[PDB]
Every structure is written in C-alpha cells, then in structure tokens.
Amino acid sequence: MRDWKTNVHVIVGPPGCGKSKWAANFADPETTYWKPPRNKWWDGYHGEEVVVIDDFYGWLPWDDLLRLCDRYPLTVETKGGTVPFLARSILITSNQTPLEWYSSTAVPAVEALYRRITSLVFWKNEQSTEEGGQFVTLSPPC
C-alpha cells in the first residue's frame, strides 16, 4: 500500500502565526486530510497524499508516531475499522519544537523521531526553513 518514506515537515510558531495556513497552502485540499486533534482516530481519511496533524504536542503514542512517519505499509484505526495509510507528506504544526513533545525519560531514543523528520520550518519574530543542527533544534534530522 505505502512503499515510500513518508516525508515529515514540522512547522513551529506561536498561536496566530499562520501555521494552519502554511499547511493548507502546501497542497490541494482534495489531497490533504486533517487529522482530528487529541485522539487516535483517522475517521474521514480516504487515502490523501498529504496529512496535516494540527496542534500536535505529543498526544499520539511514541511508537504510533514513529510508524506513521516511516516507510512501510501501515493501516491506521478509525471508529469503523482500519484504513490503509497512504500519506506521502505529513505536516505537523505545533507551538513547541519536537524537544517538548516527548521527554527522553518517556522514550527509548528521542533521535528515532528526529531522524524521521524531513524538514523544520520556524516562525522568526516570517516562516524560515531551519537546518537541523541549530540553536532552536539541537538534534540532527532526516
């Protein structure tokens, strides 16, 4: 079903900075599904190539997030049964950097998530692309 690395783009900035608009402008609405915040459900997903996880703060199980952001065939759960996960792009909007989503105490190796992140975009003081290995995200990605 999926046989490709799902790209993972994290967009960080304060409330009202245009995070949701950045996500909406990434690709066509017809190709973009918005994951309901704060639950494990993929209700309404119909195989869209772009998935947006708006206002993420680490409310998916670590291991589920690692799977979503990986490259193997994967089904995800809805209230009416599983559906194939077919994202080619996952956009994660957040007020915090990924440092803050999961503590290193709660997880085997935090670099497992960071290595699966493809790009980091940061609200300055506009949205600028950052180069993993920087002041605001210490860790390497991709």
Could you give the dihedral angle defined by the CA atoms of residues 91, 94, 100 and 102, in that order, rounded to the nearest 10 degrees?
-50
Residue 27: inside a domain: yes
Concatenating the DSSP letter of every residue in the chain gives ---SPPEEEEEE--TTSSHHHHHHHHS-GGGEEEPPTTSS--TT----SEEEE-S-SS-S-HHHHHHHTSSS--EEEETTEEEE---SEEEEEESS-GGGTS-GGGSS-THHHHTT--EEEEE---EEEE-SSSSS--S---
Tokens 């869209």, residue located: 48
Method by which the model was determined? X-ray
Residue 80 token pair: 């009416």
Q: Is residue 13 part of an annotated ligand binding site? A: yes
Burial class (CB in 10 A: 0-12, 13-18, 19+), 10: buried
Radius of gyration of the chain (CA): 14
Residue 63: inside a domain: yes
Residue 115: inside a domain: yes
Q: Is residue 15 part of an annotated ligand binding site? A: yes
- The boundaries of the domain holding residue 74 are 7-130
Q: Is residue 19 part of an annotated ligand binding site? A: yes
CATH code of residue 102: 3.40.50.300
Structural domain count, the chain: 1
Q: Is residue 18 part of an annotated ligand binding site? A: yes
Spatial distance between the Cα atoms of 111 and 62, rounded to a whole number of angstroms:
12
Q: Is residue 142 part of an annotated ligand binding site? A: no
Spatial distance between the Cα atoms of 40 and 111, rounded to a whole number of angstroms:
23
Q: CA 43: distance to chain centroid?
A: 17
